[PDB]
Amino acid sequence: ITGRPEWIWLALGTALMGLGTLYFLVKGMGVSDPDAKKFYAITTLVPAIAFTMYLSMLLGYGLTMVPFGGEQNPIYWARYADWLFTTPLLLLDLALLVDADQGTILALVGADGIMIGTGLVGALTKVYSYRFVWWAISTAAMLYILYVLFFGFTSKAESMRPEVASTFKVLRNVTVVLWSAYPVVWLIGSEGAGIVPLNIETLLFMVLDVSAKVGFGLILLRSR
Amino acid sequence: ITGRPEWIWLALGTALMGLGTLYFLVKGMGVSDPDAKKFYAITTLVPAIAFTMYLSMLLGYGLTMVPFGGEQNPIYWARYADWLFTTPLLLLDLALLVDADQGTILALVGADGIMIGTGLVGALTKVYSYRFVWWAISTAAMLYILYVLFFGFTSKAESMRPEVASTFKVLRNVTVVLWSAYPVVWLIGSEGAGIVPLNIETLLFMVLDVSAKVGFGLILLRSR
Amino acid sequence: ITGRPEWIWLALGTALMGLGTLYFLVKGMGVSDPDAKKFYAITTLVPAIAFTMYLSMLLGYGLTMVPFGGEQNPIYWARYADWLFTTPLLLLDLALLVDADQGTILALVGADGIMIGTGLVGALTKVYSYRFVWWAISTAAMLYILYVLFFGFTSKAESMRPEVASTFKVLRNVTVVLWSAYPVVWLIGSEGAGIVPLNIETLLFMVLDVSAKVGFGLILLRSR
Ligand SMILES: *C/C=C(C)/C=C/C=C(C)/C=C/C1=C(C)CCCC1(C)C
Ligand SMILES: *C/C=C(C)/C=C/C=C(C)/C=C/C1=C(C)CCCC1(C)C
Ligand SMILES: *C/C=C(C)/C=C/C=C(C)/C=C/C1=C(C)CCCC1(C)C
Secondary structure (H helix, E strand, O other): OOOOOOHHHHHHHHHHHHHHHHHHHOOOOOOOOHHHHHHHHHHHHHHHHHHHHHHHHHHOOOOOEEEOOOOEEEOOHHHHHHHHHHHHHHHHHHHHHOOOOHHHHHHHHHHHHHHHHHHHHHOOOOOHHHHHHHHHHHHHHHHHHHHHHHOHHHHHHOOOOHHHHHHHHHHHHHHHHHHHHHHHHHHHOOOOOOOOOHHHHHHHHHHHHHHHHHHHHHHHHOOO | OOOOOOHHHHHHHHHHHHHHHHHHHOOOOOOOOHHHHHHHHHHHHHHHHHHHHHHHHHHOOOOOEEEOOOOEEEOOHHHHHHHHHHHHHHHHHHHHHOOOOHHHHHHHHHHHHHHHHHHHHHOOOOOHHHHHHHHHHHHHHHHHHHHHHHOHHHHHHOOOOHHHHHHHHHHHHHHHHHHHHHHHHHHHOOOOOOOOOHHHHHHHHHHHHHHHHHHHHHHHHOOO | OOOOOOHHHHHHHHHHHHHHHHHHHOOOOOOOOHHHHHHHHHHHHHHHHHHHHHHHHHHOOOOOEEEOOOOEEEOOHHHHHHHHHHHHHHHHHHHHHOOOOHHHHHHHHHHHHHHHHHHHHHOOOOOHHHHHHHHHHHHHHHHHHHHHHHOHHHHHHOOOOHHHHHHHHHHHHHHHHHHHHHHHHHHHOOOOOOOOOHHHHHHHHHHHHHHHHHHHHHHHHOOO
16 A cells, blocks of 8 residues: 555565575685676675665655655655666676677666666656656667667677576576566556556565566576 | 746757767667777767756756745756766766776766766755855866866877877867856856856756767767 | 754864865875876775765755654764765775775675665664664674675785785774774764764764775875
8 A cells, every 4th residue: 555555575575685695695605716706796786785675665764655646656766776776787697697898788787777767757757647758768778778688698698608698598588578577567556557556566576576686596696 | 937938948958869869879780899889888878868867857857946045046956967977978988088097087087976966066055155165166176177188188199099189189179168168157057146047057058968968979979 | 963063073074084185186196107096096086075075064964854763863964975985985995905806896895885875774764773773784784894805805915915915904904993983883873872962973983084084095095
């Protein structure tokens, strides 16, 4: 509803983000190869930070009251804090893996940058119609990322060790399906056009969350 | 006045930032040399981001009401968001071009960092007299950048290919004149001591804007 | 009390941060070795930025009124702005010195990132009990940094020139004692459980401040 009905999923989300955190920490202990160590460090802040956000979200600090088209709607801007950080870090996990030219890395981060950032302003507009105007400009941002990811990073990927190629594909396909889920979820949800209730919203991004970060966590890190 | 008289220039500014964006995007398509690709990626986020800011500025989100010395004055803090990002990216375009030692790059970004950042606090102070105290400290910041730019980057520049040297000078001279324009513009303007009206302010930074980013865009990117 | 009793220490803190700034600036003038230049640039933004924060803190902008457990308490969020920037830069001074693998650098910055960041949310919670919940999670963050600093960076350090080893130890030991002081100071202080008055708080972080940045300034920079 606005800080009480989904206290559950939230709690559930904190337990999951942080468990995943304690796990990695107690899994990179060994690590000799500095090369892989990178992946580790990265593939760990993500859950950690993710944990801090899902925690303030539960306790309260998370939400805020954005006024749009009639009544006062809930907006865990706390998410965006997270996504603003995680999402880049993730891309790097990808670029870094498939050794991408800094050129594309850079354009890729900034692409994501404008995406999430704008996703925030979207979920912070008072004028009801404008909310979607950013939704638009933002998606355009994502379709960009996914494009120059599923095209390039595929090629370069599939031009080295069989290890990389395959693994890349794993995450790559997941990332695409997973990620894409958002625009819609956001939409049907209370942050955009309120179709489903917050009882849902929370739980949707909740699953997409633990799966994208810890999914991409076990999946990635547990590969050569 | 405060969101209505300059709706024009604003609209005009959005059309220009974004047009420049679509242009680059459809101009880096080819690009084989990863070296130059860097320039591209960079020389593109700038307009893009620039576009997003000038857009929220028009629709509304842009402005805010800062209270100083009597009445309530307008402050498109939205600009600063932009400048906070563009300006560094630009410097990198410069440093990167004239292959500058990370040492100076770093000190240069942070120099700009303190500049824009402080330019914000300046344009956010309630006590009328203090506004200028930051104006001061801030300018000091710029004079720093321009100094260690027009001095160093000139030398190193003029010690390679005739291409670089000349091009550097192009942008370098523009950057200096252009950039400098601000301190004054800001001043005469409503964000500092209100001399000219917002009918102007907007339109001034508007021109200095499209010219600095897209100016530096065509100018730069269209060179070897 | 809340912007008047400690106007002193504050003023004193500004004078010190900025003096240290003018000093470095007029001490890196020479510098031929690009390698060391890095240290310089870094070891300078720190004081500079530090100066800007301690200045807005004195003039006013600094503080804010956070409501927790009864009455309205003061919170120079301005600090956190500072620490959020300085602290990383410092670590880099360390990592960079003892040539640490980017892997650890990265995990180290993000470690600090979550630390300060969370230290803020801590000092921004309304519910009195939660304030300490972040205090906890945050410290955990620091103990992390100090751990993987006093362990690793020691080893790698002590495996090169006698210069480095010794110097590292200097700063390293200082950093540890100094840094640690905070959690407690914060605690006994008004930002956490209000034991001592703001007459103190200010002056404590004031000393720990000028000593950590300018301490680590002269100490570091004045070594081979
Ligand atoms: C851990 C979090 C992850 C992997 C988040 C991914 C998020 C997105 C792809 C979000 C996309 C959005 C839009 C395309 C439109 C505006 C709203 C957003 C930010 C939810
Ligand atoms: C695309 C935007 C560009 C190139 C902006 C450049 C802006 C400046 C050089 C701004 C300077 C300012 C001061 C020197 C004093 C405080 C106010 C500012 C931020 C307008
Ligand atoms: C120039 C500033 C420096 C070196 C600051 C260092 C600050 C810390 C180690 C702060 C630590 C904190 C906690 C461990 C708990 C939450 C409160 C903080 C941010 C004061």
